[PDB]
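Box S1 | Example of a co-folding query
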Amino acid sequence: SCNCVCGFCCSX
Amino acid sequence: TKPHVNVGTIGHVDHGKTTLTAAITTVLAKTYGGAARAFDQIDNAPEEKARGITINTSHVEYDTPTRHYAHVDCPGHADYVKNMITGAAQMDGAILVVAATDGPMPQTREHILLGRQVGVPYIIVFLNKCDMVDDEELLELVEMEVRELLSQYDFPGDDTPIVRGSALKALEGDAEWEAKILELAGFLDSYIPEPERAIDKPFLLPIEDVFSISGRGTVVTGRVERGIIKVGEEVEIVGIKETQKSTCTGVEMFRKLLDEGRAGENVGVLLRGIKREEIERGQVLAKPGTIKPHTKFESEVYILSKDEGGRHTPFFKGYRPQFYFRTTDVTGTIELPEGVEMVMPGDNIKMVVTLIHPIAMDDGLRFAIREGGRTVGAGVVAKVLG
Ligand SMILES: Nc1nc2c(ncn2[C@@H]2O[C@H](COP(=O)(O)OP(=O)(O)O)[C@@H](O)[C@H]2O)c(=O)[nH]1
Ligand SMILES: [Mg+2]
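Box S1 (continued) | Returned holo structure for magnesium ion
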């Protein structure tokens, strides 16, 4: 998932 | 380039911590080379703020042939308290400077006890102002006083490197004293086991966000605090409730799939079979069998002054403050030492804490105490208890 420069996030 | 070790000088006031610190940087400079530095410019330590809490701290580096050293040195006892409990200045080993004159003075003991509470693993002693000391085998019966004290809080007093020297004369440039300096640098080199790198420790990841991938399992996110998680490895989910086991079927970062998440990175980790409503923020993911959930523990806590974000009035036990560990808040109750009801701003005390649910933690975990929507205290777990 979800992030893309620097926050918490994701996928799998 | 070289392995890195964190030391600083600890011990009672005007015993020489700041002159020793400059002497070192100045000896090793004229020896191996590099940068030397001024007592003047070390003693007047600049202020830097770790999350609201201001601490006066000078940071000096010097090099031995095998090691780089980051040395921390502070002007007041209070700086040492805040620094140590806070983690703003973690140490792989401390140099306990004791003046040949006075013997262990009240901060001598407190800096040792605080070193044990906060998880400083090695202490090396420097008996200072020996150039002042005139004759006899006091230097010897003082090296014993320092040893019982050291063993009194569980350090190997019997195996402790104790170097006798004069920091001033060594800084002035007396060659026979510049000597015990280089001897001391040998003991940092020899006696402090080089520290384990974060990527080398077991995997741990404090969980920030959680969402399902339907048909696959659930994704949890965070910054890898330490270790490596690799695709296909088992993990546990620890804290807040019943530990669960899962397997890692994938790791993503910025929409890219990876084979692993490494210490320092924000990542997503997919857990096969786990469903969303059974993971809570505040739990951690961890290499299985490497970190346990406790509800009860012993800590050392510093109460913030108003200036640093807390209150100008004392903290009273009995009102169920919130303890903030990694990513979440959890209520606890406190037992203070015997007879004590309150803790004054700017003071530190020992607290035994019992939380309302379990949190993954070992000795040395940091945490914050909040109450009334105000951060009032900073603590470190000294010993987990159940
Ligand atoms: N004669 C002598 N003076 C020293 C020695 N070590 C430090 N100094 C003096 O003792 C005092 C305390 O110095 P300092 O390093 O600032 O103390 P600290 O950082 O508070 O422990 C100063 O007057 C220094 O010049 C020593 O080994 N011999
Ligand atoms: Mg000083």
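The CA atoms of residues 1 and 7 of chain A lie 11 Å apart. The two ends of chain A are 7 Å apart (CA to CA).
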